[PDB]
Design a protein around this ligand. Structure first.
Ligand SMILES: Cc1cc2nc3c(=O)[nH]c(=O)nc-3n(C[C@H](O)[C@H](O)[C@H](O)COP(=O)(O)O)c2cc1C
Ligand SMILES: Cc1cc2nc3c(=O)[nH]c(=O)nc-3n(C[C@H](O)[C@H](O)[C@H](O)COP(=O)(O)O)c2cc1C
Lengths: 368, 368
């Protein structure tokens, strides 16, 4: 019923954009379009990408820099580069090794794995791929309090060192590709099966999101932090007022995101929202930035604009489709090498230096 | 031949502006004008004060706040309120108990004492007032590297937990009041007993600046860092490029200041420079802000604009000023209570909340 790729191999990554077309040749049509697609006619996914041309990097010369160091620290974790893996559901749509393959790439590379509540793999299967590597658990909340306590407890017992509350998906975005393809999951989701009564296999994302909590309030941020005793990120923030609210409600981190343009349509590109959120956060908690990171220049620009790290999504999954853990690893390696070049050319010896960069304002936008 | 006030008493502080006119009727004209005055016709001291009207606080309603907490932490010092004592020379111009009196106020209140290299008191006199309280030592770098080694060694033996490298005073400001008054220090500087080769009574103000290092470079920042093994603040920064330079040269903090308008004339009001510096620093190191803090609203606006703490200067000294005598522990207590009010009216439960305030841009400036 679903024949995902199974080959494991390193891949030569020239750029991450070319991975999308390459993955379209190996991933079944429905699954591929679930991964690649976005809301409406995808204008906000294009905005995520074109937003990077709004703020341009300066080359800097005679900066006394050599062999830049990409390493950084977040919430007590030293990581190889200032990027983590975003929480993404159902990795088995990309590759038979599913979340275990992604986890092995992430742990082998040296950064943090975010586990989706809508994983097709069990915590045991992901833990085998991680081999001790650090992990954060992304909760899609149950409506039932006890089921949230049980999910959180399972995640922390598996070794989670933060909780990501994704709050921007109380209902599905208008994902026209998935509507046209009548996309349903071809396998179950063991972590949230408890609140689907029946199995996620043959269900639409509309109906799984429909089972999760719609009426998320700030109390939920408080109650997740109190129960887990772990730092809580609030993910999906695009408006500075939600950042201030989340922090005052007990969040330990702000995760700036529009879900890869999969949720609200005719909204800004994610990168354009980052400065106003960073200025309102004003150093109170760490910021993770995502939605549209494709190049080392994007990592640099996010850091220069207030993000502590970025999260990587689609490009890593396309890498998993093309090579299993080694393909996914190839993408993480591409980003680290890509960033190293950009650090050398911007005069940046280390990740802190990137946070100090001035960017050129491009008022003409993409067409210039 | 200098008759400073000696009376010890609490003062009912309605506002800090009135402390300037209050004090002199022993309180000597030359010393008072040394403390109160600034460069040129004082237009930049007036700019320090009027800059607070450029960004205005909003009252915030139904914010679920009571009994705000003013406490904060800087470089692992827990302090009672987000303000420290600025390094100021020659407290004996204000009061016979000189720097020991200031130190006792600061220690009893519960914040950090900054010791000027140009103290009229020995470290042991100041230490007696501090009674184990935290202290940072402010250095005026030496041409003679041995003198830098020796003063860094005394400060650390003295229990300093940071060094303040003041870099904005390589030559004196054009302080017209002191020129017209023919002002000379009426007592010595025991801490800089090593440098002045001749006499510490017979070196007016230009010659003491003269014996110091004019040719401070980034290497000076690196060398203070390596020698002290203490965090180094670079004090006097008004331009964002100097903040980036200082951090890359090993500074552990940025101290945004124009020295109370006592140095470069026809420069911006210090508060106007703070956001560009905070944006460039982008959380890399803590920021201290000073030059013109007179009210709780000023502390709040500095925090909302990127400072971790502010430093207090002239109002605390008003140990001496014009009419009847006022400035000390009462002034620190005034600032704490004034900040508490502003926190309640802005919806701020704690110091972190102040860092998230949005300010109203007043393009009309002071006359409105
Ligand atoms: C196929 C796919 C599935 C996703 N599933 C989840 C999810 O389960 N939980 C979540 O918090 N976000 C989910 N997201 C959003 C990602 O965490 C992330 O914000 C997004 O991938 C970033 O955009 P980009 O990959 O285009 O750079 C998903 C995104 C993709 C592409
Ligand atoms: C009387 C006086 C003496 C000062 N002496 C020093 C000094 O020895 N070292 C130093 O770094 N700054 C010195 N300063 C600058 C202060 O540290 C501080 O930046 C200034 O007082 C802040 O301005 P405000 O007091 O008007 O708010 C002095 C300022 C005053 C008023």
């Amino acid at each position: 019923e679903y024949n995902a790729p199974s080959e494991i191999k390193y891949i030569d990554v020239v750029n991450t954009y070319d991975l999308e077309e390459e993955a379209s040749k190996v991933v079944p049509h429905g699954g591929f379009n679930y991964i690649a697609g976005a809301s409406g006619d995808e204008w906000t996914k294009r905005a995520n990408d074109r937003a990077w041309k709004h703020k341009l990097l300066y080359p800097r010369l005679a900066q006394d820099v050599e062999a830049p160091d990409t390493s950084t620290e977040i919430l007590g974790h030293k990581i190889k580069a200032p990027f983590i893996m975003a929480p993404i559901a159902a990795h088995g749509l990309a590759h038979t090794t599913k979340e275990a393959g992604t986890a092995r790439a992430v742990s082998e590379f040296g950064t943090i794995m975010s586990i989706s509540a809508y994983s097709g793999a069990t915590f045991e299967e992901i833990s085998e791929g991680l081999n001790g590597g650090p992990r954060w658990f992304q909760i899609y909340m149950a409506k039932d309090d006890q089921q949230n306590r049980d999910i959180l407890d399972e995640a922390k017992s598996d070794g989670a060192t933060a909780i990501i509350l994704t709050a921007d998906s109380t209902v599905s975005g208008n994902r026209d590709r998935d509507v046209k393809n009548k996309f349903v999951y071809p396998f179950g989701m063991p972590i949230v099966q408890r609140y689907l009564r029946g199995t996620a296999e043959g269900m639409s994302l509309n109906n799984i999101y429909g089972a999760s909590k719609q009426k998320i309030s700030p109390r939920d941020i408080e109650e997740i932090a109190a129960h887990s005793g772990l730092p809580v990120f609030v993910k999906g923030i695009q408006h500075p007022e939600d950042a201030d609210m989340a922090i005052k409600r007990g969040a330990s981190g702000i995760w700036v995101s529009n879900h890869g343009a999969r949720q609200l349509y005719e909204a800004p590109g994610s990168f354009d929202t980052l400065p106003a959120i960073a200025e309102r956060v004003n150093k109170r908690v760490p910021i993770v930035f995502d939605s549209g990171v494709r190049r080392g220049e994007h990592v640099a620009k996010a850091l220069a604009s207030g993000a502590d790290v970025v999260a990587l999504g689609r490009p890593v999954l396309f890498g998993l489709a093309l090579g299993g853990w080694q393909g996914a690893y190839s993408v993480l390696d591409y980003f680290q090498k890509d960033l190293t070049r950009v650090m050398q050319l911007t005069g940046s010896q280390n990740v802190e230096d990137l946070k100090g960069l001035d960017l050129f304002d491009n008022p003409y936008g993409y067409e210039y």
